[PDB]
Amino acid sequence: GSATLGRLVRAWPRRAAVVNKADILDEWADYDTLVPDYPLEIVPFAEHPLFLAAEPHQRQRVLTGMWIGYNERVIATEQLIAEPAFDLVMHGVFPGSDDPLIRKSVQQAIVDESFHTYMHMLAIDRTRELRKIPELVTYRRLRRVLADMPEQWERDIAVLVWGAVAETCINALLALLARDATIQPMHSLITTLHLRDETAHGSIVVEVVRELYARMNEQQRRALVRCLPIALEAFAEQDLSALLLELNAAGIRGAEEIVGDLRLVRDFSGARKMVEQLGLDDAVDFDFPERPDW
Amino acid sequence: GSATLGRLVRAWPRRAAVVNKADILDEWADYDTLVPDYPLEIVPFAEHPLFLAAEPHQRQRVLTGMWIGYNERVIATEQLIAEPAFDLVMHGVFPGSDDPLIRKSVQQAIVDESFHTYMHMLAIDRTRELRKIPELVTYRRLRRVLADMPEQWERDIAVLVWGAVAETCINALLALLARDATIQPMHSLITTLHLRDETAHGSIVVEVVRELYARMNEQQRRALVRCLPIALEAFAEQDLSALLLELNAAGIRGAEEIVGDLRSTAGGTRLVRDFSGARKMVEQLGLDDAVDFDFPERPDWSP
């Protein structure tokens, strides 16, 4: 059995956010309204003259809004992309998925994603309380690939690939929020805890997908190589529709102009590994972006 | 919001099996092969002449297969029935289900179910390795009901009710294996942890279903009322097809004759699910008299 999987399975009790910070709720103890919810320098339009010309409380509303919006996207991703890929691995629908080490490592990740959703949901609800307060462009794609596949087995591949990519391509905001010493300490803790788990999830996915693919027959093998670039591009795309809603919700005049001038890349390093591990360096038409410093 | 739910949600970090025994894998460290996987005391047909006429290793094969089959059904019930009901609540498909407290309680329970599936899966795999080793009837009944409902809103109700019955009506094997000192210590530990979690889940389901039912439109209310007896009877039904297969695997002659009513141990201990919690749920809904179901007597072993 995979020695990486083995190591990650034995290490899970010491590493996992769920085991070690289940009492995340408590972190809103000695609360300070005086710290912002989101870092200014990570906001795409932070420097726009129509933004900077908004009133202090308007800007602060936008930052709060985007902290919230980020948690909503995280939850959507786990529930709609990531978990379902893990679930399919656990339903035993792919050859080679009965292996006990795959079952252990993947089900631990399922526990992790459930707790991630809890952490982020708590963060939304606590923020909305203390601050007195749109479909993902990755899920919409997915729903449209599936709608044109008449056989279950092919939908299985698409779900699997979409989840694998989601789990190996780290959101810049996750790593940026984790290390930010200027925002609410519980915002950077939640994101740090999530990043710690997500690191192991990337290694896990690379192993599992390597094993399933080796054991996929041909309709499943060629299905997968087709799907990957469609999935990777979907996580590469940029829709600023969410930015527009946050701007309008804060009543920022010229919201459309700001977004218009706009017209944070994921760390595709894990998906690159996964491609090399599957031996597909030359077979997938995608231009892997330069690795970030985070 | 509900005081009871407030306290369950604050208790979850102290109480949850996932936080108490994440290192459950390590529990197989000084495994003793001589110690049985399942308690003979608890086997409905333990004293059948044909079960006694078998050889001792054949009876041990049956005991191990019964432990495995138990874990397999737990996993199926969680994956196919309990989680999908919790998942619907978290998707906001019911009026009033966007309550932060409801959301907190149900997402905590979802973390729990995911860990329960982990432990039971671990038990199967470790057992199958160390011993060198069909459709749930309740899910079959569910599928039939759903296949004949035209509208999503009504299938949502049905999924919700079936999930609530599963989570309020404690499996007898869960409670009896939990307290059993004669079997592998990891087996009684896993079921003790799951039992601790499940007791809280029953209380949570009662609060949540009451808050949801209160907010449902009239046809949703009517749908839930129709569904309850269907679910209660599905779960009051034990299937013997699995047992039958174990006996045959062990090579025991006259399997069909051996497996009788599975509703009692030979000593008289009740093996039907503890319907206590679903009775409380029906009361909280004000439905004691609108639901046509004869609840069995509460068993001594009830949580």
From Swiss-Prot, chain B:
Pathway: Antibiotic biosynthesis. 4-nitrobenzoate binds at Y70, N171. The keyword Oxidoreductase applies. Keywords: Iron, Manganese, Metal-binding, Oxidoreductase. GO terms for molecular function: identical protein binding; metal ion binding; oxidoreductase activity. Contains a nonheme dinuclear iron cluster that stabilizes a peroxo intermediate. Was originally suggested to contain a binuclear manganese cluster or a heterodinuclear manganese/iron cluster. The keyword Oxidoreductase applies. It catalyses: 4-aminobenzoate + AH2 + 2 O2 = 4-nitrobenzoate + A + 2 H2O. It is an enzyme of class 1 (oxidoreductase). Changing R73A: Loss of activity. Fe cation 2 binds at E113, E167, E198, H201. It comes from the Bacteria. Changing F235A: No change in activity. InterPro entries: AurF/CmlI (IPR025859), Diiron_AurF (IPR054674), RNR-like (IPR012348). Changing T77L: Retains 14% of activity. Changing E78A: Loss of activity. Its EC number is 1.14.99.68. Pfam families: AurF. Homodimer. Involved in the biosynthesis of the polyketide antibiotic aureothin. Catalyzes the oxidation of p-aminobenzoate (pABA) to p-nitrobenzoate (pNBA), an unusual polyketide synthase starter unit. Reaction mechanism involves the generation of a peroxodiiron(III/III) intermediate, which effects the initial oxidation of p-aminobenzoate to p-hydroxylaminobenzoate (Ar-NHOH). Ar-NHOH is then probably directly converted to the fully oxidized p-nitrobenzoate via a four-electron N-oxidation, bypassing the formation of a nitroso compound. NCBIfam families: diiron_AurF. This is 4-aminobenzoate N-oxygenase. It comes from Streptomyces thioluteus.
